[PDB]
Amino acid sequence: GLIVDTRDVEERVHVMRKTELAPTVAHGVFNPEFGPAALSNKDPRLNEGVVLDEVIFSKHKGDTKMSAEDKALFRRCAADYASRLHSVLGTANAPLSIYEAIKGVDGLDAMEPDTAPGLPWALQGKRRGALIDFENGTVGPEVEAALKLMEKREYKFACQTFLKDEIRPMEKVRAGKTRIVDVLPVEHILYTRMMIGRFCAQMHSNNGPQIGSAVGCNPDVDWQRFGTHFAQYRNVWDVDYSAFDANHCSDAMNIMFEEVFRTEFGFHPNAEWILKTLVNTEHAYENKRITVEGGMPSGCSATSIINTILNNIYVLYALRRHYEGVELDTYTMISYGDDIVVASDYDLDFEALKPHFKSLGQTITPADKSDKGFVLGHSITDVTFLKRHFHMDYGTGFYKPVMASKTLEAILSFARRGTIQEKLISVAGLAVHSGPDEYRRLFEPFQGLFEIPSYRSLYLRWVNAVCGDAAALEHH
RNA sequence: AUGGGCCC
RNA sequence: UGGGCCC
Ligand SMILES: [Mn+2]
């Protein structure tokens, strides 16, 4: 995005310099090159002379202004993708009711009861429970006012900033590159679900390479489905973006909402409007109130869906801008926000696409750092998606999501107080695909202290989930 | 100490 | 109601 104005308001909001992620017994054993993100401005382990909040908003390099030819090209790509998208999902995207928006629908889960309320509720100190009732499906008078304001399109708001308490690489922790969370108001999140919840739910259930979205997927079971698809193609690319969410230019965002969420496809008139308010935002960090143009605020409703849609359109846009006579069936892809895997039988040159992505404001680079110039001939077994490799299981002969051991060590090395036991059960479901020897080694430090599930138990669970009949066939 | 997904 | 992982 582009920072247009900065000013210090008289009021001030509390941040989060507590870092709840404490080390575990594993940390001393594995000695990982990872640690909690630097939340304090005077954090001792930061590099010399690094002002934290200075680095925080360094992602906002600018709002890439597109030309009329480029905007016209982008509009056609948005329309063509939208055509494909709604032909699979259908045209049933009617306005969702207040009950359905809160309680969810078949595909879309309910809203989080105990979570950050946003502005101007966090200042006065009113949580979601005060405004919206739990397990009820109704809204208070403060929210009701916002709904009617959003109908007339008079509603305005400001995004609340929060430092993301998470584990990051020590190089980025020392650099002071802590990621930020853009918390929108609860009424915005609610109304967004009313406008496009029917659409979002439908995408989750129909996730796959056809619509080009992995939002709604379960890696354990769906890795087989995706693996077999991408293995069929000759060339596969593990593309990585640089600040994908921040670098969404206004022209790209505005045109995408105008083509995808039209009244022709069943959406409400305000479905376009509510999404367009994400373009120009006002972010509140402590005392500084920063007005920003362009970029997606990470924390609005359907952020992963909007990013996924934009990601799909960018690939279509970039190819058509370089090559001639390119269509949707020319290539295949699936994405989850910024994360993407592209494939095609044609020998496409992604190195030549670099500047065509730069017109959108995006900077694509290869995930595989070796050479670092977008080579050809790669397969699904080389690439990564959702921090998971695609490896063939030696027993069942299906693809399984295998995370890197160094990543798994970093996860196990840190935890909140009291959550260690429950975390060890959850992470074991991820670690099972690494293999019996690697599974044992990852949970070796925790032996004789916490409950560690067996390899046999979690493997047999996965075999039932990935198919179910595969387990039954082995008996006969 | 968000948005959504998935597993508990 | 709470925990984890991914984006
Ligand atoms: Mn990737």
Ligand 1 midpoint to CA A28 (Å): 30
Distance CA A362, CA A251 (A): 13
**Looking at beta carbons, which pairs linking A242-245 to residues 24 or more positions away fall under 8 Å?**
A242/A362, A242/A363, A242/A364, A242/A365, A243/A59, A243/A61, A243/A363, A244/A307, A244/A311, A244/A337, A244/A338, A244/A362, A245/A295, A245/A296, A245/A298, A245/A303, A245/A307, A245/A337, A245/A338
Q: Are strands A159-163 and A280-285 parallel, antiparallel or unpaired?
A: parallel
C-alpha A363/C-alpha A354 separation (Å) is 7
Distance A102 CA to ligand 1 centre (A): 32
What are the DSSP calls for A172-207, one per residue? HHHHT---EEEE--HHHHHHHHHHHHHHHHHHHHT-
What does the alpha-carbon distance between residue A123 and residue A280 come to, in Å, rounded to a whole number?
A: 22
Two structure tokens written together for A310? 């934009």
For residue A84, give the H/E element and its range: helix A68-89
Structure tokens at A316: 């279509």
HSE, side-chain direction, 13 A CA sphere, residue A257:
24
Residues 6+ apart with CB under 8 A from A101: A111, A190, A191, A193, A194, A197
Give the residue carrying structure tokens 């996924």.
A308
Q: Can you say whether the dihedral through the CA atoms of A344, A349, A355, A361 is positive or negative?
A: positive
CATH, domain range A208-248+303-403: 3.30.70.270
Residues A51 and A42 sit within 8 Å (Cβ to Cβ): no
d(C-alpha A160, C-alpha A178), whole Å: 16
| CA of A100, C1' of B5: distance in angstroms | 18
- A59-CA/B8-C1' distance, Å: 35
Contact of A186 with A128, CB cutoff 8 Å: yes
Residue A336: φ, ψ to 5°? -135, 90
Taking Cα atoms as reference points, which of A260, A266, A341, A331 lies closest to residue A302?
A260
| Angle subtended by helix axes A219-231 and A455-466, to nearest 10 | 60
Q: Which nucleotide is nearest to A184 (CA to C1')?
A: B2
- Alpha-helical (H) ranges within A277-339 are 303-322
- Bridge partners (DSSP) listed for residue A289: A7, A284
Tokens of A116: 């950050």
Tokens 């308010």 sit on residue: A277
List residues bridging with A292 in a β-sheet: A3, A281
Nearest to A53 by CA among A148, A142, A176: A176
Peptide bond into A185 cis (omega under 30): no
The resolution in Å comes to 2.8
Contact A319/A348 with Cβ under 8 angstroms? yes
- The integer distance in angstroms from the CA atom of A318 to the C1' atom of B8 is 41
Find residue A183's DSSP bridge partners: A160
Domain boundaries defined on chain A? 1-207+249-302, 208-248+303-403, 404-476
Determine the 3-state secondary structure of A222 from DSSP.
helix
Q: How is domain A404-476 classified at the CATH fold level? A: Mitochondrial Import Receptor Subunit Tom20; Chain A (1.20.960)
**Are both A208-248+303-403 and A404-476 of the same fold?**
no
Q: What is the largest distance, in Å, between two alpha-carbon atoms of chain A?
A: 74
Residue ranges with CB less than 5 Å from ion ligand 1 = A 339
**Closest nt by CA–C1' to A411:** C5
Phi first, then psi, for residue A402 (nearest 5°) are -110, 115
User: What is the spatial distance, in angstroms and rounded to an integer, between the CA atom of A419 and the C1' atom of C3?
Assistant: 6
* A276: Cβ contacts below 8 Å, ≥ 6 apart: A253, A254, A257
CA angle A298, A62, A195 (to 5 degrees): 35
